[PDB]
Every structure is written in C-alpha cells, then in structure tokens.
Write a protein that binds this ligand. Structure first.
Ligand SMILES: c1cc(C2CCNCC2)n[nH]1
Length: 167
C-alpha cells in the first residue's frame, strides 16, 4: 500500500489522475517526483517552472551547481537531485522537445530512467510545452515503465481524452 489517492488504474503498474503535480507532491511527499527537465536544467516554464517556483528557486540553485560541475544532460537522460520541500528526490528527466526538433524515438529512452525507481510521481514526458502528442507519451510510458508510476495530468480536458482513448 502507498499514499497516492484518487488515481485511475490503467495497467498493472501505471496510474493516472487529473492533478497539479506541484499540489500532489506537496500532499504526498513521494520518494521520487519526476521533473520535465531540459539538458541545461533551466526550470523556466511548464512543469519544471512550476516545480522550481514551489521550491522558492532552491531547485534552480542546486541545478546550476550540478551543471557547473557535470555539464548538460543528454536528451533521453536524467539525474537525481534533491526533492526539496516536494519529495525526497527529484528525478530530472529530459524528454525530446519537438519544438526544438529532437528525435521522438528518444522518448522511450527518457521513460527508461523511471525503471531505476520503484515508485514515482511523474508528468507525461515530452507533453505540454515540449510539443509531443500526450496520447503517444502515455502509450510509450505504459509500454516502457515497469515500476509503479503515478501520472499527474494538469489539464482536465486532456486527462479525459487520455482515459477515454486509452487502449
Ligand atoms: C563519476 C561521478 C559521477 C556522478 C554521479 C552523481 N552525480 C553525477 C556525477 N558519475 N561518475
């Protein structure tokens, strides 16, 4: 048993809810929250901007030190940093950004990072301002992630479309 509430079960391991991931993280304090990161860990907008704002910019301060030491992530890659006030850990995962012309085949590689963690609270990778089709992102998630993933979908309209179109 875990503390996640109100989720619809899609598969053995994947769960979904219409929720603000920031508010969900604050309530649950999961072991791992996933950030929709870019390779520079510049948390300006989308899910990353919202998570970073909720940490009072401490996520960005930690991230800048990480980049100064290690250099940028790979598209499809990840790093584990603090979860600050939201979670124990934040898994910063870089899905391909269609609005920058990145290979959508890298979305599967991105989701493979989730398999290193037994339970995660996550957004749909490459959705929102990253420009991918969220229906596609959910299919790749279900067909790639084997650990237990709790997906938060901010937009109620999109949530209902994801559920009603799910195969
Ligand atoms: C040597 C050092 C590492 C670090 C692992 C923790 N954070 C990123 C770099 N990998 N290989």
């Amino acid at each position: 048993v875990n503390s996640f509430s109100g989720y619809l079960k899609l598969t053995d391991n994947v769960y979904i809810k219409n929720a603000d991931i920031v508010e969900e993280a604050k309530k649950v304090k999961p072991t791992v929250v996933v950030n929709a990161a870019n390779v520079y860990l510049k948390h300006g907008g989308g899910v990353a901007g919202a998570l970073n704002k909720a940490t009072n910019n401490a996520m960005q301060v930690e991230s800048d030190d990480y980049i100064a030491t290690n250099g940028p992530l790979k598209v499809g890659g990840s790093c584990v940093l603090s979860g600050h006030n939201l979670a124990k850990h934040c898994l910063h995962v870089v899905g391909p950004n269609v609005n920058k012309g990145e290979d959508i085949q890298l979305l599967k590689s991105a989701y493979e990072n989730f398999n290193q963690h037994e339970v995660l609270l996550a957004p749909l990778l490459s959705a929102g301002i990253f420009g991918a089709d969220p229906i596609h992102s959910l299919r790749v998630c279900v067909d790639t992630v084997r650990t237990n993933v709790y997906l938060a979908v901010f937009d109620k309209n999109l949530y209902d479309k994801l559920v009603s179109s799910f195969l």
